[PDB]
Structure 1
Amino acid sequence: KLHKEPATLIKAIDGNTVKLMYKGQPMVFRLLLVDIPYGPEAAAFTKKMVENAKKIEVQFDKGQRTDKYGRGLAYIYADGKMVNEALVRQGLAKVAYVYKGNNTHEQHLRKAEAQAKKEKLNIWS
């Protein structure tokens, strides 16, 4: 049972990294299960999604919540749409290996990735 928490964008950093205001504090977040080999495109895509959002949500998974560099490991939602999956579906990123038990949406993203590859979209072109 994963819970979505409200957050506020502070600065877009790149395809799978953004800075947010979470629980009265700024924190860098690394989008779970998404690897970025189109770097500028992914960055642009994510940047557009969060900056144009009227609601940003942070959803931690069931495993470790922060990586070695202190970045929050989570699923980020823009207006209810998961950025992690959108990137993958748009073929602007691949599904990463599960990390410390954070695999709740792994299957979901794998299908997005399969369809993207089936459409030979961007990184799959």
Structure 2
Amino acid sequence: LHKEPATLIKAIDGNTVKLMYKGQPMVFRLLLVDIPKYGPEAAAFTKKMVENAKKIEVAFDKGQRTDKYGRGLAYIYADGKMVNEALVRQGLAKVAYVYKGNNTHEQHLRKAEAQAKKEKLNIWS
């Protein structure tokens, strides 16, 4: 998948952020990440990862690129590290059902989730 540059504009929550993409603002929903008392923790985690980053990148998958609410559906990277995966591995989010063919990192995410589950981390306490 192609990683494209972006600039953080504003953190919203665990799996949602506003970014400057291709010369304009756009809300992005992190692909394959679902947020089920960890809502604030997830929000804080993502916020910190993207604000302290010296580089943000977005990578669209092979399926539909935006949901019905107009948000871009992608894998977000902070300093080369995928936020989507970090959240799941930290047990702050579960892996969501694949949406419109966007499943490139599903397996990689299910593994991270399994490990988080094995570790009884946060949501898996």
**TM superposition score normalised by structure 2:** 0.99
SS of the aligned residue for 1:13 comes to strand
CA RMSD of superposed structures (Å): 0.2
Gaps of 5+ in 1: none
Q: Distance in 2 between matches of 1:59 and 1:91?
A: 22
% identity of equivalent residues: 99
Q: Find the aligned partners of 1:59 and 1:112 in 2 and give their Cα distance.
A: 19
The separation in 2 between residues aligned to 1:54 and 1:22, in whole angstroms, is 16
Q: Deviations over 1:59-107 (max 9, x none)?
A: 0000000000000000000000000000000000000000000000000
Equivalent-residue separation in structure 1 for 2:111 and 2:10 (angstroms): 30
**Unpaired runs of 5+ in structure 2?**
none
Aligned residue pairs: how many? 124
Off by >2 Å, runs of 4+ in structure 1: none
> What is the CA distance between 1:33 and its match in structure 2?
0.1
Q: Distance in 1 between matches of 2:53 and 2:120?
A: 28
Counterpart of 2:45 in 1: which secondary structure? helix
SS at match of 1:47: helix
Query: What secondary structure sits across from 2:17 in the alignment?
Result: strand
